[PDB]
Design a protein around this ligand. Structure first.
Ligand code: HEM
Ligand code: HEM
Ligand SMILES: Cc1cc(N)nc(C[C@@H]2CNC[C@@H]2OCCNCCc2cccc(F)c2)c1
Ligand SMILES: Cc1cc(N)nc(C[C@@H]2CNC[C@@H]2OCCNCCc2cccc(F)c2)c1
Ligand SMILES: C[C@H](O)[C@H](O)[C@H]1CNc2nc(N)[nH]c(=O)c2N1
Ligand SMILES: C[C@H](O)[C@H](O)[C@H]1CNc2nc(N)[nH]c(=O)c2N1
Ligand SMILES: [Zn+2]
Lengths: 401, 404
């Protein structure tokens, strides 16, 4: 019934009772675990009712007059039109809850602090662009980063979706070369090629910021260039290794995810970009060291004069550590908010304890929460986790092309 | 495509489908409502179905499925269970079963070696003294003066109404952990309970950080008996670093032979409660888990101080820098002393080859992602980018509760 959850460093035990609230199935069965894989009116009515019940309970007014009447408005709207609409205060609560509920997010200690921009009165791609430019300015705040989400109009039965084609608001281009190598970020070759086809004049650098492709319902997407001054970037240098600055490496300040679906009370928001601040291992380990990304390990190790001929000299491990240190030092120097993996995972353990008290559990995906270097050096490695789907939720959605 | 799990490698873009999971006859701990993949601990009628399944597996592996010899063996097994409530394996059946149990183990990254296991049949064993002899022979063979060889020794199976053969120690070689008066521990904190049981049963304890424990061996229906391993049998490696001359002065060491001794080996419904097995180390198990876990030897702060690192702030990456040098010391020292070891990069590469081999041979491979990905430098290894399906196949190694 209720799974026992143990921490192996400290010997402490808790029981997850929150998983009983899950009404949506994951990919696992008793026959096989798939935890490591990356990917009608009556049903809508009950999702809506549950959500409204969640909202009135959060403001302590459960059972009040305002509660009963709001339930009746929703019922009347769905019965007549097949759908309904959220009040701004309900949207705000719903967005925070979807963050709180996200099992892959190590940053959830911050869940209560989220600026929510209501963009549901948007009727064109041009208006979308203005809203996005305002989000970026707010979120960036000259390096003193603030968590934010902007919510565009919900999906509707009659028509096509509002969509941002880009997976993040800020990404670097990937240019496929004559010889089948890539200049820039190999993760972005396909979106880069789409941008060119839709009329963008491409650069030829390793760190060219991509334009946005924004789609209003049932229209071809439109191209918008981000004003250079809005996109804060950090040149990478190393505290003791002088030649590192000459590698010419940089990363953008703002991690801003733009391709996920936000589901609240049965309603679905197909464009709802959100942003926080980076955990340094995302940049230092994954973006720069992954073999299928910028893949810089070998170059850094040679500058460091390490023996690259054999794996047993641990040259990959040594180079990776220095790159991560360069990221942390450079962000700190440029006064841009960042968190290291030790500090982030310590705050996550506190979030786990807060949530055990508040709700009797916390859905968490161990493979995503444990950092990609120095796993067992962090307290989360030794912590058992239960993974399940609660709503409101963020959900992956297929690329619109 | 097909209705079997689709499995993707995100570095290479390649896809396979797992069809082997269809052969699974035992439930794991997950359901559609919640994943429990990260948790460490998960009649004649019943026996016969498991026995028939295993005999069918054996006859398929020798390509004699449906033959007269196959049907005759099946008839011999059920007749034996009819008269006795149990049955017994042939020598070649035990050998097949033990290798298949290793092949099936989802938490083992060393499975490229599965076909090369020396299997010692100790099913004639009738006393604690004789268990000790067999165990000493295992260690001598497996250690081979540092050129390590994979092996298992199989003691008699569980029997109706008669007590079990059990080895009380979790490994054949482990260090004592001595509880101090201030509440701290000298030696290995993992071993505090077993250390205290050895003293209760008459062992005169040392007072060092690396005292090898004696064995507590239990023959059926007797109290366990205490046996000290002759020191010349236990190969150890003093730890030094290739460039940091002071590292040798910390007096650190580790033993050569990883030999798990408390797992149950299950073959065709038969239960082997004592069947210790051994291979060689992957270096991260010593360098990262044994030496750096905060609940183990916990030496990270000590080494960082000698390295002159800023241990008062997380963002200096002092833990990461120290862990790398400790892992490097382990690899260098084993290589110097000519004792077999494998680094995490070479092991995970070889496991990627094993995955490909098994895709062709059986249509999949059960694997536990959280255990296969090494505890340092995870995404620098190929296995981090590889999706994995986890399920239980028999023959199997299974955890068993401590005898005390
Ligand atoms: C405030 C600082 C934050 C930090 C340090 C942080 C940290 C992280 C990290 C390290 C990941 C895994 C990233 C990856 O490997 O792709 C992640 C995932 C995620 N986070 Fe956060 N987060 C923050 C804020 C936010 C905010 C504001 C939201 C939404 C309101 C959010 C929702 C999510 C979601 C939905 C995922 C899963 C994304 C996916 O499947 O690709 N987080 N977080
Ligand atoms: C040939 C050298 C071998 C290497 C490098 C190797 C590697 C490993 C590693 C690194 C682990 C994880 C250990 C941990 O973190 O506790 C493991 C687990 C395991 N291996 Fe191996 N292995 C080898 C040989 C063997 C052999 C000979 C067997 C049995 C015949 C075996 C069966 C197992 C089993 C049953 C586990 C799970 C143990 C548990 O749940 O505590 N492996 N292996
Ligand atoms: C195919 C697929 C499925 C899925 N769920 N997700 C993806 C994005 C991948 C995940 N791994 C790299 C890349 O996503 C990279 C962007 N991740 C930033 C997360 C983040 C960090 C800090 C603050 C935030 F607000 C958000 C792809
Ligand atoms: C409670 C519990 C359950 C379980 N399944 N397992 C344990 C042993 C723990 C697992 N993690 C550390 C420790 O096991 C330490 C010993 N593991 C060595 C595995 C190995 C390596 C190379 C060759 C071999 F033949 C065997 C405890
Ligand atoms: C195959 C595996 O699930 C995949 O590489 C995952 C592992 N853990 C991860 N963890 C985080 N935070 N982000 C990721 O993209 C991944 N990728
Ligand atoms: C909580 C978590 O399941 C636990 O700490 C696991 C994670 N992965 C591991 N992986 C290996 N190889 N060995 C272990 O002991 C563990 N411990
Ligand atoms: Zn699962």
């Amino acid at each position: 019934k209720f799974p026992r959850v143990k921490n192996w460093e400290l010997g402490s035990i808790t029981y997850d009772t929150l998983c009983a609230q899950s009404q949506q199935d994951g990919p696992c069965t008793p026959r096989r675990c798939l935890g490591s894989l990356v990917l009608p009116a009556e049903q809508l009515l009950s999702q809506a009712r549950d959500f409204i019940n969640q909202y009135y309970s959060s403001i302590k007014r459960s059972g009040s007059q305002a509660h009963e009447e709001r339930l009746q408005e929703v019922e009347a709207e769905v019965a007549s039109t097949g759908t309904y609409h959220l009040r701004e205060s309900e949207l705000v609560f719903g967005a925070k809850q979807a963050w709180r509920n996200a099992p892959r997010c190590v940053g959830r200690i911050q869940w209560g602090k989220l600026q929510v921009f209501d963009a549901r009165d948007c009727s064109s791609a041009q208006e979308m662009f203005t809203y996005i430019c305002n989000h970026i300015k707010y979120a960036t705040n000259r390096g003193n980063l603030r968590s934010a989400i902007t919510v565009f109009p919900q999906r509707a039965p009659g028509r096509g979706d509002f969509r941002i084609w880009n997976s993040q608001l800020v990404r670097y281009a990937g240019y496929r070369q004559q010889d089948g190598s890539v200049r820039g970020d190999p993760a972005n070759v396909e979106i880069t090629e789409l941008c060119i086809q839709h009329g963008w004049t491409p650069g030829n650098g390793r760190f060219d910021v991509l334009p946005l492709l924004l789609q209003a319902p049932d229209e071809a997407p439109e191209l918008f260039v981000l004003p250079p001054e809005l996109v804060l970037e950090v040149p990478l240098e190393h505290p003791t290794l002088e030649w590192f600055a000459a590698l010419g490496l940089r990363w953008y300040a703002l991690p801003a995810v733009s391709n996920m679906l936000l589901e609240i009370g049965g309603l679905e928001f197909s464009a709802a970009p959100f942003s926080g601040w980076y955990m340094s291992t995302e940049i230092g380990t994954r973006n720069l060291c992954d073999p299928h990304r910028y893949n810089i390990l070998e170059d850094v190790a040679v500058c460091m004069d390490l023996d690259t001929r054999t794996t047993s000299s641990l040259w990959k491990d040594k180079a990776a550590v220095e790159i991560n240190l360069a990221v942390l030092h450079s962000f700190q120097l440029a006064k841009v908010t960042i968190v290291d993996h030790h500090a982030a995972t310590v705050s996550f353990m506190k979030h786990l304890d807060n949530e055990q008290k508040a709700r009797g559990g916390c859905p968490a995906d161990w493979a995503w929460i444990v950092p990609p270097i120095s796993g067992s050096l962090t307290p989360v490695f030794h912590q058992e986790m239960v993974n399940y789907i609660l709503s409101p939720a963020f959900r992956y959605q297929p690329d619109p092309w």
